[PDB]
Specification:
PDB class: membrane protein
Family (chain B): Belongs to the transient receptor (TC 1.A.4) family. LTrpC subfamily. TRPM4 sub-subfamily.
Strand content of chain A: under 5%
Subunit structure (chain B): Homotetramer.
Largest interface: A-C, 18 and 19 residues
Organism (chain B): Homo sapiens (Human)
Protein name (chain B): Transient receptor potential cation channel subfamily M member 4
Number of helices of chain A: 40
Oligomer: part of a larger assembly
Bound molecules: cholesterol hemisuccinate, calcium ion
């Protein structure tokens, strides 16, 4: 047989398998591994059970099913106890309309189901529907383990539930042995010898008081602890052979402790703790200590785990909490983790490296991590990670455990650097991830650390701008002496650079030891008077270091690079305009050639001295030059320097002289546009230089729409008035160039409109002609339909000069509104990349840079990493100050979360739920009075 | 009666022994009379829908279209 | 089921479910009021 009806049944024999049944439950058509199993035994006489036993199953047992997984093992027939359990499952899945569709295996015998369609003998794969001492099968159970031997299936289930109890619970097969328990609603003679075997296989029976035949016969005995038992057994059994029915009860009562009585009218909401109560008496000192709190973790029920630890003779020792946090970590369950750390663990006796290797061993097999470990058994993390909070925070980032990493960040030191560090990993490790489904969660949890790093630093910056400046430039001993700005660069942390604390910190790094509120004109006055450096103007924070704080600062290296480049373009122009005769190169032209060699020697310094890509110190030039020729400026810097080289090579050869001048005039154009890339570091200009490249998508639409209209206008005008000087350079000029200039107010009416030109007899061709006075207007044009050419100009100036130009302004004004936020956000992050690009550059500019290249190359024959230095005791005062402001920040967000309106409505509704749970006790006062 | 709270507690509780035809004609009046919230309840407790959608009952379902509709006449136009 | 959870955990549907549980409280605490009659007979 196979599945059918969408339940998954099969027929088997008694002797078959403990394991190949349960593997065929869990692997094939897998529901889950349970967190317990409540096997229910004891039939009625045929009619309906009592109302409170029905309510014990309604919202006492199946409530504990949907809360804890917890598949129920029953008969399956619609007349035994499986009817009444089947009533409860069918009730509860419509009672709570959300639900989780509780699972219940109805282990039945094959020779009882009367409407057997004999499911499809090839392989048992049918979806075959059932037609609804010959009892049927339900439609309410998720399975039906039909047994082809009501006696045969009993030795199977006790063989089954013993195997279930041997199976461990937890991801990776480690954790607790699963809890199995028999639930004994009242039965018969056979029900007493049923649960004797359960004690022999060590099953914690859970008989219910006030039930009847088999339960209350045993319930009166378990309260009869330290000749009367002759009488009381006969009270529930009018049937004979009382003697072994006496004698087997003491065989049960040899155990006496793998057995508890569900007290009548004392549970039904406490049932989930009474179930919990029976297991501890069962484990209480051999069976793999169940510890009562490790169990509540495995059930994934938080409210049990608090009240167990907050109350109930609170004497929790070390190892009681130690293995409890393992299953809180191995199974995902982050809310249990915060509870245990709130009651405090060691974390120096907890993070022993076996347990970390244990923690990484429970990674899922088909991950991008387990194989990534086995591949290794960002890429340096693989060479660093192998199988008190930082290693634990590292773990939860690696396995994409979101709320675990959000918590482990909160319990450790180094809040800002590990928030930037978490953003660094999850952007790197998403690129190292094959599939893009989980990379959406990997990138979302990177934004959540981007939120907390920006939020916590903005608190620390408004606290003390000086002491939070030291937060970035601290020598972080992680990552081989990393810096938090360097951490934010490699993370591509655009939101972290965008905040006003980091941006005001960048100006202070920009004006390095020169008091960044200094004016600009005083820097100009001190650049062109180095005597004026030591004066009443620019303030700073040995007169030789005072010299080097000025000329080593990135604004003066910038202004050195700007002054020396405006003088390059002034030398370039004075060569190009007045010193460029076909003679061999003179004084200033050779000075220009050396100047642009240094420009090229300064171009290879960025090339062989150059994370969202490779790591620092790649040392193979197929990455360093590939990342060089990827900057859009270098591409401009090399096009400039290569056609300077073309313009000089063509100049020096005698034939190609005018082509060498022509290439150098376009070469001035490209060196001057590189003036834009230099001033994008400016706060006033820079965010607007980055805008004007976002405008190119609208220029290209305009240039498309105009060019189509310029072909349309230009050929139709050149076709209507037919010039007689129709050379292809002049035809392609009156078609394109002359209409293009009409957009800019150069409208040659005298060349297109015949009524404005005289000399109307200028061609022997038939028709009437007229002479336009323009030089490239044709010798004579036609005057056939020159009403149209004049009309067709009017349509041109309307479309081009009014429709196209003013719609381009609407397109610029729109996309300036969109990209203003995002390109300023992009410029903020780009800014620090340009601050330290001048800080690492030598202090001497382009023409005099050869001094600082004959100093660097003489360094090799004799053989910017920004980090402020401070003492370790002043360094730990920083992290102590900053871990206070993390705690003052997490507790501030926790109060704002609790005092939110969405969480008062949660806490009000749960207190009305607490009212009705306790006012329902008051209702049962009527029964308390009716007995009175 | 168009009262939902009765229909849940009748079906969730009270000696729950509902058979086939007890649910079959119940969903008809849940469909013929508009009442969609009763429909979700019965499908939540499960119907056949292969023994429920017999083509007499679909023709029964279309027969309860309102007379002055743009559908009943549109059927009668197509009839 | 994801939209059904977001509908139930909405604030507009907690206020519906809170008010109906206070309505359930008063319907059941009104039973407790008629305890005075149950005591006055006693
Ligand atoms: C081709 C010509 C312009 C030859 C250059 C003549 C130079 C001797 C002098 C005349 C005035 C100088 C300028 C005076 C004002 C400054 C502002 C200065 O801006 C900054 O460095 C700080 C702004 C920031 O924070 O980014 C750049 C250099 C600059 C343009 C100087 C560049 C070189 C200039 C043009
Ligand atoms: C059909 C005819 C007109 C030939 C087409 C020529 C244009 C497509 C090209 C040639 C020169 C280009 C310009 C050369 C200088 C630049 C500066 C550039 O700004 C930057 O480079 C800033 C650097 C950065 O943001 O990364 C923006 C485009 C722009 C105006 C270009 C706009 C498009 C131009 C006109
Ligand atoms: C901006 C978008 C909408 C397209 C506009 C393209 C024109 C403005 C460009 C492309 C073709 C170019 C022309 C190709 C042919 C000539 C004729 C030429 O006149 C000569 O005979 C001198 C030497 C020669 O090229 O033969 C002068 C340059 C000119 C106007 C070129 C400069 C401007 C033109 C018309
Ligand atoms: Ca460059």
């Amino acid at each position: 047989t196979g599945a059918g009806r969408h339940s998954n049944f099969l027929r088997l024999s008694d002797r078959t398998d403990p394991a190949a049944v349960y593997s065929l439950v869990t692997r094939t058509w897998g529901f889950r591994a349970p967190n317990l199993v409540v096997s229910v035994l004891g039939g009625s006489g045929g009619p309906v059970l009592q109302t409170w036993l029905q309510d014990l199953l309604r919202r006492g047992l199946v409530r504990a099913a949907q809360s804890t997984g917890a598949w129920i093992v029953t008969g399956g027939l619609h007349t035994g106890i499986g009817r009444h359990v089947g009533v409860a499952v069918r009730d509860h899945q419509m009672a709570s309309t959300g639900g989780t569709k509780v699972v219940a295996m109805g282990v039945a015998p094959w020779g009882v189901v009367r409407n057997r369609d004999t499911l499809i003998n090839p392989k048992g794969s049918f979806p075959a529907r059932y037609r609804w001492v010959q009892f049927p099968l339900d439609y309410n159970y998720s399975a039906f383990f039909l047994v082809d031997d009501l006696g045969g299936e009993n030795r199977f289930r006790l063989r089954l539930e013993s195997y279930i109890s041997q199976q461990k619970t937890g991801v990776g097969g480690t954790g607790i042995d699963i809890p199995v328990l028999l639930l004994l609603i009242d039965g018969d003679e056979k029900m007493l010898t049923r649960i004797e075997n359960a004690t022999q296989a060590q099953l914690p029976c859970l008989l219910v008081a006030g039930s009847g035949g088999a339960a209350d016969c045993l319930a009166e005995t378990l309260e009869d602890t330290l000749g009367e038992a002759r009488d009381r057994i006969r009270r529930f059994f009018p049937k004979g052979d009382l003697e072994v029915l006496q004698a087997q009860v003491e065989r049960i009562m040899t155990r006496k402790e793998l057995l508890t009585v569900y007290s009548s009218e004392d549970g039904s909401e406490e049932f989930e703790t009474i179930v919990l109560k029976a297991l501890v008496k069962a484990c209480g000192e051999a069976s793999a200590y169940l510890d009562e709190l490790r169990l509540a973790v495995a059930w994934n029920r938080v409210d049990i785990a608090q009240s167990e630890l907050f109350r109930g003779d609170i004497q929790w020792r070390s190892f009681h909490l130690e293995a409890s946090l393992m299953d809180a970590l191995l199974n995902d369950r982050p809310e249990f983790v915060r509870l245990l750390i709130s009651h405090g663990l060691s974390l120096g006796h907890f993070l022993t490296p076996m347990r970390l290797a244990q923690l990484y061993s429970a990674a899922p097999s088909n991950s991008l991590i387990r194989n990534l470990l086995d591949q290794a058994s960002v890429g340096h993390v693989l060479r660093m990670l192998l199988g008190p909070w930082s290693d634990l925070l590292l773990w939860a980032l690696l396995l994409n455990r979101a709320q675990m990493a959000m918590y482990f960040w909160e319990m450790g030191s180094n809040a800002v650097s590990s928030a930037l560090g978490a953003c660094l990993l999850l952007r790197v490790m998403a690129r190292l991830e094959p599939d893009a489904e989980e990379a959406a969660r990997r990138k979302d949890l990177a934004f959540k650390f981007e939120g907390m790093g920006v939020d916590l630093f903005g608190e620390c910056y408004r606290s003390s701008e000086v002491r939070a400046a030291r937060l970035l430039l601290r020598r972080c001993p992680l990552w081989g002496d990393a810096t938090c700005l360097q951490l934010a660069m490699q993370a591509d942390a655009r939101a972290f650079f965008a905040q006003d604390g980091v941006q005001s910190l960048l100006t202070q790094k920009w004006w390095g030891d020169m008091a960044s509120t200094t004016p600009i004109w005083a820097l100009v006055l001190a650049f062109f008077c180095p005597p004026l450096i030591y004066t009443r103007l620019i303030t700073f924070r040995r007169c030789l270091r005072r010299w080097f704080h000025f000329w080593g600062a990135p604004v003066t290296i910038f202004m050195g690079n700007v002054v020396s480049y405006l003088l390059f373009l002034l030398l370039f122009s004075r060569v190009l305009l007045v010193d460029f005769q076909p003679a061999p190169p003179g004084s200033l032209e050779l000075l220009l050639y050396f100047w642009a060699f240094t420009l090229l020697c300064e171009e290879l310094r960025q090339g062989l001295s150059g994370s969202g890509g490779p790591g620092p110190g790649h040392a193979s030039l197929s990455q360093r030059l590939r990342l060089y020729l990827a900057d859009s400026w270098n591409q401009c810097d090399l096009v400039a320097l290569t056609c300077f080289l073309l313009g000089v090579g063509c100049r020096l050869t005698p034939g190609l002289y005018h082509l060498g001048r022509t290439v150098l005039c376009i070469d001035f154009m490209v060196f001057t546009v590189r003036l834009l890339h230099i001033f994008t570091v400016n706060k006033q200009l820079g965010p607007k230089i980055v805008i004007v490249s976002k405008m190119m998508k609208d220029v290209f639409f305009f240039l498309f729409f105009l060019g189509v209209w310029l072909v349309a206008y230009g050929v139709a005008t050149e076709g209507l008035l037919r010039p007689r000087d129709s050379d292809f350079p002049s035809i392609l000029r009156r078609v394109f160039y002359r209409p293009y200039l009409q957009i800019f107010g150069q409208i040659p009416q005298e060349d297109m409109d015949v009524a404005l030109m005289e000399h109307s007899n200028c061609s022997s061709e038939p028709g009437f002609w007229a002479h336009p006075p323009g030089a490239q207007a044709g010798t004579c044009v036609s005057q056939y339909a020159n009403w149209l050419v004049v009309l067709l100009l009017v349509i041109f100036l309307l479309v081009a000069n009014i429709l196209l130009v003013n719609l381009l302004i609407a397109m610029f004004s729109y996309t300036f509104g969109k990209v203003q936020g995002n390109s300023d956000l992009y410029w903020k992050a780009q800014r620090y990349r340009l601050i330290r690009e001048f800080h690492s550059r030598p202090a001497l500019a382009p023409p005099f840079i050869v001094i600082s290249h004959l100093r660097l190359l003489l360094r090799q024959l004799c053989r910017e990493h920004f980090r402020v230095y401070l003492s370790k005791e002043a360094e730990r005062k920083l992290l102590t100050w900053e871990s206070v402001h993390k705690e003052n920040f997490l507790l501030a967000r926790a109060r704002d979360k609790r005092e939110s309106d969405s969480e008062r409505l949660k806490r009000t509704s749960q207190k009305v739920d607490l009212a009705l749970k306790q006012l329902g006790h008051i209702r049962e006062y009527e029964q308390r009075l009716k007995v009175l």
